[PDB]
Ligand binder design. Structure first.
Ligand SMILES: Cc1cc2nc3c(=O)[nH]c(=O)nc-3n(C[C@H](O)[C@H](O)[C@H](O)COP(=O)(O)OP(=O)(O)OC[C@H]3O[C@@H](n4cnc5c(N)ncnc54)[C@H](O)[C@@H]3O)c2cc1C
Length: 284
């Protein structure tokens, strides 16, 4: 009766699971909410010039899927003296959607059965059953499935900041280095999100490194000097992105019959989740 089990309910598991559910499948999710997941700090802003490598071949079917399922909003961002249109999917809408039921437990094993796949859970005598399994477990995907591509999965950490009870009159993109932009916008009607775009080897991460990105972000919105961290006015959101070098969109591979690995979204984020989901609707 269960068609697909999706392991992981970050952006990639959430989007894939709901696209399959919308396509008529019986989908079940499993997620253990482990700390440092990649999707908590995400803004889900998609500027078309950021995704040139992808190609209209993939950008457009992906954006259409996200618009059909969640709705895509067009935001006119300030870019110096000029303006630029950026597409937005509300991350709270993607990550909080409840169509797909999610077991808030830890997957410990995957086993082929005669009818499909059995998904073991920590501390559970029975396994969850499905014809197919999509493992969208972020940087932890290689803990459950292995492949030459997954042998290259590493984490690229980063931080973004959310200021409470605040709105920007001007949502902006401002560069601080080639291909490094400080982005500030109204992520909710009450909150301002700012990120500087840096990615870090999770080893080279510490409070000093975080304060460097905080200084960038707070100067871009004129909050430097106000001690907003110590005062509780801003939340730091740390996450580890799943990076695999050389990935086309992201990694979507059928490692065994019915067993898919969906990860490697550090490079392109939400738009490549949309591409992968459209692929899975076609192929499952
Ligand atoms: C600072 C920062 C800024 C970002 N900004 C953006 C942005 O503007 N736009 C954008 O699109 N993206 C953004 N991202 C996100 C980026 O695209 C990530 O690559 C993306 O979130 C990856 O999502 P994922 O679903 O593959 O992984 P994750 O979000 O890490 O999800 C993996 C999930 O799998 C679960 N899991 C793992 N193993 C198991 C197990 N054994 N059993 C059960 N559950 C398990 C984990 O608990 C977790 O919830 C940002 C990330 C960071 C850190």
């Amino acid at each position: 009766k269960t068609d697909v089990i999706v392991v992981g309910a970050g952006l990639f598991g959430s989007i894939a699971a709901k696209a399959l559910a919308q396509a008529g499948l019986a989908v079940v999710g499993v997620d253990d909410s482990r700390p440092g997941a990649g999707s908590l700090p995400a803004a889900c802003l998609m500027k078309p010039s950021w995704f040139s490598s992808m190609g209209k071949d993939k950008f457009e079917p992906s954006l259409e899927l996200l618009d059909r399922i969640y709705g895509v909003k067009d935001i006119s961002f300030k870019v110096g003296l000029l303006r630029a249109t950026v597409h937005w999917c509300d991350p709270a809408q993607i990550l909080g959607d409840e169509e797909v039921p999610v077991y808030r437990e830890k997957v410990t094993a995957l086993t082929r059965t005669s009818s499909g796949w059995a998904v073991s859970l920590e501390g559970r005598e029975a396994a969850l059953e499905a014809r197919s399994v999509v493992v969208a477990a972020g940087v932890w995907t290689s803990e459950l499935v292995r492949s030459q591509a997954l042998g290259g999965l590493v984490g690229r950490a980063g931080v973004a900041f959310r200021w409470q009870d605040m709105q920007l009159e001007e949502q902006f993109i401002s560069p601080w280095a080639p291909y490094r932009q400080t982005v500030g916008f109204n992520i909710s009607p009450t909150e301002v999100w700012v990120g500087d775009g840096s990615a870090i080897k999770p080893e080279n991460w510490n409070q000093d490194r975080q304060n460097v990105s905080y200084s960038r972000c707070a100067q871009a919105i004129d909050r430097a000097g106000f001690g907003d961290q110590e005062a509780g006015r801003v939340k730091a959101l740390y996450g580890i992105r799943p990076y695999i070098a050389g990935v086309k969109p992201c990694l979507l591979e059928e490692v065994e019959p019915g067993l898919w690995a969906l990860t490697g979204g550090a490079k392109n984020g939400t738009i490549s989740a949309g591409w992968a989901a459209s692929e899975l609707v076609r192929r499952i």
